[PDB]
Write a protein that binds this ligand. Structure first.
Ligand SMILES: O=C(O)CCC(=O)C(=O)O
Ligand code: PRO
Ligand SMILES: [Co+2]
Length: 280
């Protein structure tokens, strides 16, 4: 299971515009804000109970049910009906990233008894929106249905004035990946997207490690966000931010900041429990 395009669909811009206008005014969940650097957020379209109040994810066996929000988005409802198997869906969300926001580099599923198969259908995006995986950066285009191997280190950012919205579907984890996307066109091969990021250098590295002189509890959040965003513009690994933070704090020499840095990396990449939240 490599991250890839499963298929491509035609989006109907008129009907899409209508549902996007409703989502622009919708109440988004604050759950998993511990993963957000800025305005990375989602809302529930389908979940276990069909209730708007149910906003965290667990592995379960129920064909997901449309929430009231779900029901008020009839075109997105239709897409879900037509391009996936109903009984295989466990969640469907809209995930929006607004200007200069990202989800912090992480792996998913650590707190879950099992995994999902995570699928993105891109609704509204642009050239300044990126997803990343390990050492790579790529753009998921409008109408593309992508399988995301969320068990690998990854992130996603939006660096445009305009927000980016993806329909994200969690399919029960033992399903056959080739069977997931229904009624889709096979994508043609295309030009590889070349990685336009800057080469990482000893200068850029020393500059980052220089924050050892100023890092404190008062600016920790800002520094973490800056570090998280670097791999969208420099050729470095998703996870390198955590090594940088650890070395920044080792040089600073304050025990509290070193412990936090260890916990940060651990929570996002190594180990966390069900319902556990990372406040930093
Ligand atoms: O593209 C996004 O907003 C989120 C990417 C991600 O971390 C996920 O879907 O697991
Ligand atoms: O798996 C999930 O849905 C949450 C959201 C991002 C981090 N983990
Ligand atoms: Co993820």
């Amino acid at each position: 299971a490599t991250t890839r395009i499963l298929g491509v669909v035609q989006l109907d811009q008129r009907r899409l515009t209508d549902d996007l206008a409703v989502l622009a005014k919708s109440n988004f969940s604050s759950e998993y804000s511990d993963f957000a650097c800025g305005r990375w957020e989602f809302c529930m379209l389908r979940n276990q109970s069909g209730k708007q109040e149910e906003q965290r994810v667990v592995v379960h066996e129920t064909p997901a049910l449309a929430t009231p929000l779900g029901q008020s988005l009839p075109y997105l409802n239709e897409l879900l009906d037509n391009h996936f198997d109903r009984d295989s869906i466990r969640y469907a969300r809209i995930i929006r990233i607004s200007e200069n926001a990202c989800i912090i580099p992480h792996r998913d599923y650590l707190e879950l008894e099992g995994k999902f198969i995570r699928v993105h259908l891109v609704l509204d995006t642009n050239e300044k929106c990126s997803n990343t995986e390990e050492n790579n950066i790529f753009h998921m285009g409008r109408g593309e249905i992508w399988f995301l191997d969320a068990s690998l280190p990854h992130s996603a950012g939006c660096f445009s004035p305009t927000p980016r919205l993806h329909l994200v579907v969690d399919i029960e984890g033992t399903r056959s990946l080739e069977e997931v996307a229904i009624n889709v066109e096979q994508p043609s091969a295309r030009n590889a997207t070349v990685d336009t990021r800057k080469e990482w250098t000893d200068e850029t590295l020393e500059s980052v490690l220089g924050f050892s002189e100023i890092i404190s509890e008062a600016n920790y959040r800002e520094i973490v966000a800056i570090l998280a965003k670097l791999h969208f513009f420099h050729k470095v690994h998703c996870v390198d931010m955590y090594g940088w933070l650890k070395e920044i704090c080792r040089r600073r020499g304050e025990p509290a900041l070193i412990e936090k840095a260890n916990s940060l990396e651990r929570f996002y990449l190594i180990d966390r429990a069900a319902g556990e939240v990372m406040t930093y």
